[PDB]
Amino acid sequence: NPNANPNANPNANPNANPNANPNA
């Protein structure tokens, strides 16, 4: 599923605080 997304880290949980991430 995730490895088809070109605009996201294919690893689960790439940021501890996702709301801090403006690019996700």
Partner: antibody, heavy 121, light 113 residues
């Protein structure tokens, strides 16, 4: 204006290697995933691979027919994406396209003119 | 792989008349995030592909209003309201919910004079 220019294509003997470049201008190259496509003479469009922005790990994905042999790379300082091909087969003969993948529109949006690669003895 | 089959493969359209192109995928294109990863491309003769529609129904900027998309799940339709000479070429749908990204085989559109 967004510009993408493919180069490096030409006549290559089977089993040999060839590197294609996607030289870009008009945008911050590092922020975008770059994707490669190909089209055999008279055939449809075929996805080859893409490489993510280093903002998302900078890793690449590849089509089935293409793996082991091809490596997609990116030079963020020069704004150039690469398609490194190895052990080419006649079936790899195609126009190869590079494309800027959007963020709102997360697919191949802007395409270069393509570069013809001919694999033949 | 996800199979994408377009019907018909060829279309002869009287100028000013509509055209409809179907695309069927072997799996659903609706992802868990609520987006549907179906896109429509046009390749004019001797030209690079250009995007027409993203996510089933959305027009890329500068695409004429006579182009519209619709559908859901596994069945999608591209509609050209009033075909012109500029619309001649091969239309592809493309999915990217799954690797590899795959295209349909392409639907050729010509003017019927």
């Amino acid at each position: 204006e967004v510009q993408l220019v493919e180069s490096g294509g030409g006549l290559v003997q089977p089993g040999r290697s060839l590197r294609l470049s996607c030289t870009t201008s008009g945008f911050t190259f590092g922020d975008y995933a770059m994707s490669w496509f190909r089209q055999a003479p008279g055939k449809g469009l075929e996805w080859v691979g893409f490489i993510r922005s280093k903002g998302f790990g900078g890793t690449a994905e590849y089509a089935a027919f293409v793996k082991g042999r091809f490596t997609i790379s990116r030079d963020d300082s020069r704004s150039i994406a690469y398609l490194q091909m190895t052990s080419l087969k006649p079936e790899d003969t195609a126009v190869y396209y590079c494309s800027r993948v959007g963020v709102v529109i997360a697919t191949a949006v802007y395409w270069g003119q393509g570069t013809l690669v001919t694999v033949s003895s | 792989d996800i199979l994408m089959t377009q019907t018909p493969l060829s279309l002869s359209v009287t100028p000013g008349q509509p055209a409809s192109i179907s695309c069927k995928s072997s799996q659903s294109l609706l992802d868990n995030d609520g987006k549907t990863y179906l896109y429509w491309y046009l390749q004019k003769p001797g030209q690079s592909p250009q995007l027409l529609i993203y996510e089933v129904s959305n027009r890329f900027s500068g695409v004429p209003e006579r182009f519209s998309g619709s559908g859901s799940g596994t069945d999608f339709t591209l509609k050209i309201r009033r075909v012109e000479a500029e619309d001649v070429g091969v239309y592809y749908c493309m999915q990217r919910i799954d690797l590899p990204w795959t295209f349909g085989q392409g639907t050729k559109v010509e003017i019927k004079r």
